[PDB]
């Protein structure tokens, strides 16, 4: 199983200056619950924007730099190595890799942030003619989750 895992705003912004534009602890829990015990694959820029591999799951970084080496990260050097990865594999970022993978993945777990942020990194355009909506769950607003958001699980038609 090969999935995308992304949070993007109303205009598909996912990042701004190496940072997430919004603070949404519920979506952090969503990511932990979905990806704990499985594989995250990310581009080099996405990985270095995080700075450390995420605990309790496999961390795979795609780069052409053959000296790249981090404690806790397995390196791949081509898209084609993604297909050799076992288990449930989530493509985690960034814009480039999503552009490389959005036409290949089985499904997408999207968190839609119901906001318009300033961004410099974008998720690819997609249309619901190609994706059926398996589930659509509103996030609960509260104390620390101040922005409306919605958990979509989209499956390719
Ligand atoms: N929520 C997110 O996902 C966010 C991600 N962001 C944000 C934080 C938000 O910080 C962004 C960086 O500006 C960056 C914007 O540039 P982007 O190219 O989209 O980032 P990628 O993670 O997709 O990294 C691309 C790198 O992996 C790359 N890569 C992509 N495809 C291949 C490939 N097919 N073969 C070998 N390497 C590849 C190659 O790595 P390298 O330069 O060290 O060789 C490439 O430069 O995205 C990071
Ligand atoms: C939590 C944000 C998020 N949600 C969903 N549903 N999918 C994603 N792919 C990302 C993401 C992201 C970027 C790579 C990112 C994650 C994290 C992060 C994610 C999970 N635990 C700790 C940090 C920190 C910084 C980051 O960019 C600056």
UniProtKB/Swiss-Prot annotation:
InterPro entries: DHFR, DHFR-like_dom_sf, DHFR_CS, DHFR_dom
Keyword Transmembrane: no
The EC number(s) this enzyme carries: 1.5.1.3
GO cellular component: cytosol
Residues of the signal peptide: none
GO molecular function ontology, one term from the record: dihydrofolate reductase activity
Matching SUPFAM superfamilies: Dihydrofolate reductase-like (SSF53597)
Binding site for substrate: 5-6, 27, 49, 57, 92
Positions annotated to bind NADP(+): 6-7, 14-19, 43-46, 62-65, 92-97, 100, 121
Gene Ontology annotations of biological process type: dihydrofolate metabolic process; folic acid metabolic process; one-carbon metabolic process; tetrahydrofolate biosynthetic process
Key words of the record: NADP, One-carbon metabolism, Oxidoreductase
Major enzyme class: oxidoreductase
Pathway the protein takes part in: Cofactor biosynthesis; tetrahydrofolate biosynthesis; 5,6,7,8-tetrahydrofolate from 7,8-dihydrofolate: step 1/1
Origin: domain of life: Bacteria
The UniProt record lists the keyword Disulfide bond: no
Residue ranges annotated for the DHFR domain, each copy included: 1-156
Pfam families: DHFR_1
Transmembrane segments annotated in the record for this chain: none
Catalytic activity field: (6S)-5,6,7,8-tetrahydrofolate + NADP(+) = 7,8-dihydrofolate + NADPH + H(+)
Sequence similarity: Belongs to the dihydrofolate reductase family.
Function: Key enzyme in folate metabolism. Catalyzes an essential reaction for de novo glycine and purine synthesis, and for DNA precursor synthesis.
Miscellaneous note of the record: There are two DhfR isozymes in S.aureus, this one is chromosomal and is sensitive to trimethoprim.
Protein name: Dihydrofolate reductase
Lineage: Bacteria, Bacillati, Bacillota, Bacilli, Bacillales
């Amino acid at each position: 199983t090969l999935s995308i895992l992304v949070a993007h705003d109303l205009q598909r912004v996912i990042g701004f200056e190496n940072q997430l534009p919004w603070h949404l602890p519920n979506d952090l829990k969503h990511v932990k619950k979905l990806s704990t015990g499985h594989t995250l694959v990310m581009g080099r820029k996405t990985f270095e924007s995080i700075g450390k591999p995420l605990p309790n799951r496999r961390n795979v970084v795609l780069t052409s730099d053959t000296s790249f080496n981090v404690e806790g990260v397995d390196v791949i050097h081509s898209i084609e190595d993604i297909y050799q990865l076992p288990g449930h594999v989530f493509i985690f970022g960034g814009q480039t890799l999503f552009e490389e993978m959005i036409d290949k993945v089985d499904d997408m777990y999207i968190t839609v942030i119901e906001g318009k942020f300033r961004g410099d990194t974008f998720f690819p355009p997609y249309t619901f003619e190609d994706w059926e909506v398996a589930s659509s769950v509103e996030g609960k607003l509260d104390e620390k989750n101040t922005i409306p958001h919605t958990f979509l699980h989209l499956i390719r038609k």
